[PDB]
Amino acid sequence: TYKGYLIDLDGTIYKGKDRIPAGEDFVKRLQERQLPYILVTNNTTRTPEMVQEMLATSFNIKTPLETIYTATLATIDYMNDMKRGKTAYVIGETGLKKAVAEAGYREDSENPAYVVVGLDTNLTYEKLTLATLAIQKGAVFIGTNPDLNIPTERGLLPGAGAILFLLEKATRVKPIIIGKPEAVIMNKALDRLGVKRHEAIMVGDNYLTDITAGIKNDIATLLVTTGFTKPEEVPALPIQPDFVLSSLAEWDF
Amino acid sequence: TYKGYLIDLDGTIYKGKDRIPAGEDFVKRLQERQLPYILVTNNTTRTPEMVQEMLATSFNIKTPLETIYTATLATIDYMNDMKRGKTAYVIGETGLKKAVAEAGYREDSENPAYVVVGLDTNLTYEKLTLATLAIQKGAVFIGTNPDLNIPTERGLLPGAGAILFLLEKATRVKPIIIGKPEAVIMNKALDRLGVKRHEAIMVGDNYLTDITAGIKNDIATLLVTTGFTKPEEVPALPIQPDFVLSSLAEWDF
Amino acid sequence: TYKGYLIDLDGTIYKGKDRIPAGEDFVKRLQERQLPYILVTNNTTRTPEMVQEMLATSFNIKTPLETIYTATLATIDYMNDMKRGKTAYVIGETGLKKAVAEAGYREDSENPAYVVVGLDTNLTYEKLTLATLAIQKGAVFIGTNPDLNIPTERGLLPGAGAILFLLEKATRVKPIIIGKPEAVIMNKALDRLGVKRHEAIMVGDNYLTDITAGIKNDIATLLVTTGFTKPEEVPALPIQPDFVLSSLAEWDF
Amino acid sequence: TYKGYLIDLDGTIYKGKDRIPAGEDFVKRLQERQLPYILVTNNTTRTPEMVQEMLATSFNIKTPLETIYTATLATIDYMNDMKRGKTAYVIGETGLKKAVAEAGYREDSENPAYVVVGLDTNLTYEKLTLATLAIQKGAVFIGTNPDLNIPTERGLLPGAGAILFLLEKATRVKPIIIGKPEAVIMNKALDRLGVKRHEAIMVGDNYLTDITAGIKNDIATLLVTTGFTKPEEVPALPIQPDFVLSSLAEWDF
């Protein structure tokens, strides 16, 4: 019997601008059984509030603010835990840069204690240079998420992970990456879930980001053939998830 | 105030055949304060009993059997957690192969549910072939530890990580690695420690295996300039440990 | 107008134990026009003589011994060119070890000037250890071919490239690799061809080993959908070969 | 007896704004013996003319324009050799973009036949996106040089190779890289040199870019402890160059 649920957002409880009624129902059912759950996303542009509002406004999902855990939150928690200088140079969208500054880390492009990098659609050589120099001086190099690509209406564009690799190559230092499928975001989400590791299960549509997040961190997994990972691709997966479903509606608590 | 201690064995509380009185004293002091602690090692050849006996016989350290957590134990716990077939093909020393079989996984070189690989000083092409074929058929590919080398009286020889890479290249599947600095061994050790993540601290002499284990998994770190990582090398480290000491004797609980 | 032809053996002018009449005819046609050509193979087990005999006995192809250029020959030529000690430690089949010794490099497992590695179906940890130690001491690390796998009647087994990666990881030194698609074998084959680079063309069935060999080394390419690379896979290739044919019979000199 | 000389520019015959009289003399001596030589640089910002003028104006070196071979020239030669569409999307300084357009490849950011990438100190996400999309559609992905860093008065900044890796990760296609130490620039430089491979020798100050260029491509090497690779670092080199000198003045033709 699973006591807690970790759930991916986009691709699982909705897809793009389109919704997935089974997904919305899944959350409602969880709320009805009063089963704890946390929505985990690698998105670093929208704040928890924005995410909460989007869910209620566009997908009939009304969930407490505390159930929304993003890579931005995980990154700040990690920064607070490691406790090094209260300065950071951040590469990313305005939202991420704002969240970090408001969390107490003022922007310092010269000798920051931390260099945090997420997707920045306004990336410039100068920003990369600033980060490279700071990392070389000893700043703690952190990546918000490893995704090599970001799927947009325009196509498969460069993701945070691609930018991170550029910096890794230029500085020779491997960034500590927070988001799925890495350990930190999963550990913290698990912590908020308030359940023991073997009592939780990660629910998602993306094999590489969600299911691997489970397998790699010793957490049970439920893969829904909706979203990214197509149903025909499952037989070829290197490691089968613990459960595979075509719709969350098939899940029985 | 740190409430629990994760501690590396070789290089920290002793070195090679030589001992480190400060290290032995560190454990004794922990025992006196009744502070929980777990000795974590990536070694897969000696059983917990063997390790316990070695400590008492050669280094005046008498510690309960439950305080000794190895990569072998972590690997078996993981195998038990994932719960797939009770079969496995194992590459490693007789000790590792025995522990896995006795844990309930009979050797099956044809269609094992798991393929477990650790250091095997008797590695042969045939064993690699057996593992490769099994992995290709869908077996869950697990590595006991990532170390690229194993330091012996003969010199820096090929470690489990080097063998793992051969297999990764041959099968195109990345192994889930259990030992330090990866998540699973640290999560389980933390679990046995019985303390919250932010209340623990990882103590070691090796920056890459012990300190990185802390940083990567959001656990405080204490680096002792004894062992592997020389004291002159510390200024150049990409991420400074939370604490650096020349001797464990300098530590004040 | 192409003046010289570099041609892959297995998969192009024959496949496995099965033959390809169009392939055999291709060579015969070349001989008739008196167009220079060199057969290039990454195989390190059969000597040029063995290869020559196999061609005549099993595939009606009678070609001069000098038209057969293997990775073994290329490797020895390279060793002779670099001119370092006349000693080498070799990992591979008896044929390769013999060819190197007969080329003037006596086996020295302690301080060889060169460490040469090709596929060895009798690979052992001891041999890997011998190679690792020798490389660490400064021996020039050479790989006969990069192939990650070797297709056998038993299936896709570990190739020379997989063994090479194990050593690369264990020693931290990248091996200089001779065979296709690397530069050395192509440069030397081109040299024996007696034609200028832009006047030659590489003919093969394997995109990764033969066509990439051309593209990477600025040599025209002719891909035959026979062998390894299936015809449906061609549209997805990252770089299209200069020419694509379903049969060599379609080629017009 | 060496009949031809391939020589690195910066770090060898001068360093930064500072000059190296021994270097300048080396070229003059070559000119006196009428020994053929080609100056090879991975720099893609200055045209051959600019390079020629700089040498004469700032370092008393007057050399024919044809003796200056850059990665830009090598890249264009390669593009002309492969002969695919006369369109290309280029990421780099204005100089590189201009040279490619003037070589007959008009800028097409939608469906270019080639996507060429060199260092661009004005890199933007949009340019990376344009390149990523084009590569995905089948454009031939070319990198001017592999250098992970570019040393500037500001420090060790991101080089062309770092940008190339971002793109490789985002598209999953490995770029064919032209500059040192890869094969194409060396083959073409050798061609202009007008000598046989074993009769030439690569002279440089950088082990990774110049000496490796020799070793990897079977060309003799002369390492001058001036520039990048410090003299104390030589004993630890994985492969010793054929010759090591503290000053070019020590060289005897």
Between CA A41 and CA D31 the distance in angstroms is 65
Structure tokens at B153: 């009286």
Residue D9: DSSP 8-state: -
Domain shared by A9 and A39, yes or no: yes
Between CA D70 and CA D47 the distance in angstroms is 8
Residue of D217, D218, D234 to mutate, interface with C, max C Cβ within 10 Å? D218
Nearest alpha carbon to residue C110 among C82, C91, C89:
C89
Q: Which residues of D touch C78 (CB under 8 A)?
A: 218
A176 forms beta bridges with: A142
**Which one of D81, D197, D239 has the shortest CB-CB distance to C198?**
D81
Residue of B166, B167, B173, B174 to mutate, interface with C, max C Cβ within 10 Å? B166
Between chains, do C158 and B128 touch, taking CB under 8 Å as contact? yes
Asked if chain C contacts chain A via 3 or more Cβ pairs within 8 Å, the reply is no
A140 forms beta bridges with: A114
Q: Which residues of C touch D198 (CB under 8 A)?
A: 81
Q: Do residues D6 and D122 lie in contact, with contact meaning Cβ atoms separated by under 8 Å?
A: no
Structure tokens at A78: 């990690």
Between CA D190 and CA C83 the distance in angstroms is 20
Domain shared by A38 and A134, yes or no: no
Between chains, do D166 and A170 touch, taking CB under 8 Å as contact? no
Between CA A190 and CA A196 the distance in angstroms is 8
Structure tokens at B99: 């522990």
Helix, strand, coil percentages in chain C from 3-state DSSP, rounded to 5:
40, 25, 35
CA dihedral (C67, C73, C75, C81) in degrees, to 10, reads -90
- What would you measure as the largest C-alpha separation in chain C, in angstroms? 54
Structure tokens at C66: 């000098």
Residue of A125, A141, A148, A171 to mutate, interface with D, max D Cβ within 10 Å? A125
**Which one of B121, B124, B161 has the shortest CB-CB distance to C169?**
B161
Q: Nearest CA to CA, how far is A37 from chain D (Å)?
A: 33
Q: Do residues D227 and D205 lie in contact, with contact meaning Cβ atoms separated by under 8 Å?
A: yes
D155 forms beta bridges with: D152
Helix (H, G, I), strand (E, B) or coil at D99: helix
Between CA D135 and CA B69 the distance in angstroms is 49
Between CA D228 and CA D237 the distance in angstroms is 13
Domain shared by A78 and A115, yes or no: yes
Query: By a Cβ cutoff of 8 Å, what residues of chain D touch chain C?
Result: 78, 81-82, 138, 140-141, 173, 176, 183-184, 187, 197-198, 215-218, 238-240
Domain shared by C94 and C157, yes or no: yes
Residues in CB range of A124: below 8 A, 6 or more apart: D122, D123, D124
Q: Which amino acid, one-letter code, is at B138? A: G
Domain shared by C170 and C185, yes or no: no
**Which one of B121, B149, B170 has the shortest CB-CB distance to C125?**
B121
List the alpha helices (DSSP H) in D66-204.
71-82, 94-102, 125-136, 160-171, 183-193
Domain shared by C252 and C133, yes or no: no
Between CA A103 and CA A114 the distance in angstroms is 13
Structure tokens at D213: 């260029």
Q: Do residues D44 and D145 lie in contact, with contact meaning Cβ atoms separated by under 8 Å?
A: yes
Q: Which residues of D touch A124 (CB under 8 A)?
A: 122-124
Burial (CB count within 10 angstroms: exposed 0-12, middle 13-18, buried 19+), residue D222: buried
Q: Which residues of D touch C138 (CB under 8 A)?
A: 238, 240
For A90, phi then psi, to 5°, come to -120, 135
Which helix H or strand E contains C53, and what residues bound it? helix C48-59
Residue C10: DSSP 8-state: B
**Which one of B121, B122, B166 has the shortest CB-CB distance to C158?**
B166
Between chains, do B159 and C170 touch, taking CB under 8 Å as contact? yes
Between CA A108 and CA A138 the distance in angstroms is 13
Residue of C80, C82, C173 to mutate, interface with D, max D Cβ within 10 Å? C82
Give every strand in the sheet of A106-107, ordered side by side.
A106-107, A87-91, A114-117, A140-143, A176-177
Which of D161, D179, D197 terminates a domain? The answer is: D179
Helix (H, G, I), strand (E, B) or coil at C149: strand
Resolution (Å) of this entry: 2.3
| Helical axes D71-82 vs D94-102, angle rounded to 10° | 30
> The tokens 């491509």 sit on which residue?
D217
Between CA C130 and CA D177 the distance in angstroms is 34
Between CA C133 and CA C111 the distance in angstroms is 9
Domain shared by C219 and C123, yes or no: no
Which of D148, D179, D210 terminates a domain? The answer is: D179
Which of B130, B154, B179 terminates a domain? The answer is: B179
Helix (H, G, I), strand (E, B) or coil at D84: coil
D184 forms beta bridges with: none
Between CA B124 and CA C126 the distance in angstroms is 9
Kindly report whether the peptide bond that precedes residue C151 is cis, defined as omega within 30 degrees of 0: no
Q: Which residues of A touch B238 (CB under 8 A)?
A: 138, 141, 173-174
Between chains, do C184 and D82 touch, taking CB under 8 Å as contact? no
Q: Which amino acid, one-letter code, is at B85? A: G
Method: X-ray
Between CA A191 and CA B196 the distance in angstroms is 10
Between chains, do C166 and B163 touch, taking CB under 8 Å as contact? yes
Q: Do residues A117 and A160 lie in contact, with contact meaning Cβ atoms separated by under 8 Å?
A: yes
Domain shared by B115 and B186, yes or no: no
Nearest alpha carbon to residue B103 among B120, B88, B122:
B88
Q: Which residues of A touch B183 (CB under 8 A)?
A: 183, 216-218
Q: Nearest CA to CA, how far is D95 from chain C (Å)?
A: 24
- The 3-state secondary structure of chain B reads CCCEEEEECECCCEECCEECHHHHHHHHHHHHHCCCEEEEECCCCCCHHHHHHHHHHHHCCCCCHHHEEEHHHHHHHHHHHHCCCCEEEEECCHHHHHHHHHCCCEECCCCCCEEEECCCCCCEHHHHHHHHHHHHCCCEEEECCCCCEEEECCEEEECHHHHHHHHHHHHCCCCEECCCCCHHHHHHHHHHHCCCHHHEEEEECCHHHHHHHHHHCCCEEEEECCCCCCCCCHHHCCCCCCEEECCHHHCCC
Between chains, do C81 and D216 touch, taking CB under 8 Å as contact? no
Burial (CB count within 10 angstroms: exposed 0-12, middle 13-18, buried 19+), residue B6: buried
Between CA B151 and CA B154 the distance in angstroms is 8
Q: Nearest residue of B to residue A216 by CA position?
A: B176
Nearest alpha carbon to residue C23 among C196, C227, C236, C237:
C227
Helix (H, G, I), strand (E, B) or coil at D221: strand
List the alpha helices (DSSP H) in chain A.
21-33, 48-59, 71-82, 94-102, 125-136, 160-171, 183-193, 212-216
Nearest alpha carbon to residue C134 among C150, C119, C117:
C117
Helix (H, G, I), strand (E, B) or coil at D200: strand
**Which one of C81, C138, C198 has the shortest CB-CB distance to D198?**
C81
Between CA A210 and CA A203 the distance in angstroms is 7
CA of D245: how far to CAs of B6, D22, D242, D248, in Å? Answer: 51, 12, 10, 7
Structural domain count, chain C: 2
Task: Give the CATH number of the domain where residue B95 resides.
Answer: 3.40.50.1000
Between CA C118 and CA A212 the distance in angstroms is 35
Q: Is B95 left (phi over 0), alpha (psi -120 to 50) or beta?
A: alpha
Between CA B147 and CA B152 the distance in angstroms is 13
Q: Nearest CA to CA, how far is C21 from chain D (Å)?
A: 31
Structure tokens at C73: 């020959």
Q: Which residues of C touch B177 (CB under 8 A)?
A: none
Domain shared by C89 and C13, yes or no: no
Q: Domain of A170?
A: 71-178
Nearest alpha carbon to residue D131 among D171, D102, D84, D74:
D171
Q: Do residues C143 and C101 lie in contact, with contact meaning Cβ atoms separated by under 8 Å?
A: no
Residues in CB range of D1: below 8 A, 6 or more apart: none
Query: By a Cβ cutoff of 8 Å, what residues of chain A touch chain B?
Result: 78, 81-84, 138, 140-141, 173-174, 176, 183-184, 187-188, 191, 197-198, 215-218, 238-240, 242
Burial (CB count within 10 angstroms: exposed 0-12, middle 13-18, buried 19+), residue D11: buried
Between CA C209 and CA D175 the distance in angstroms is 16
Domain shared by A141 and A174, yes or no: yes
Query: How far does Cα D164 stand from its chain's mean position?
Result: 15
Domain shared by D90 and D161, yes or no: yes
Q: Which residues of B touch C148 (CB under 8 A)?
A: 169-170
Domain shared by B236 and B144, yes or no: no
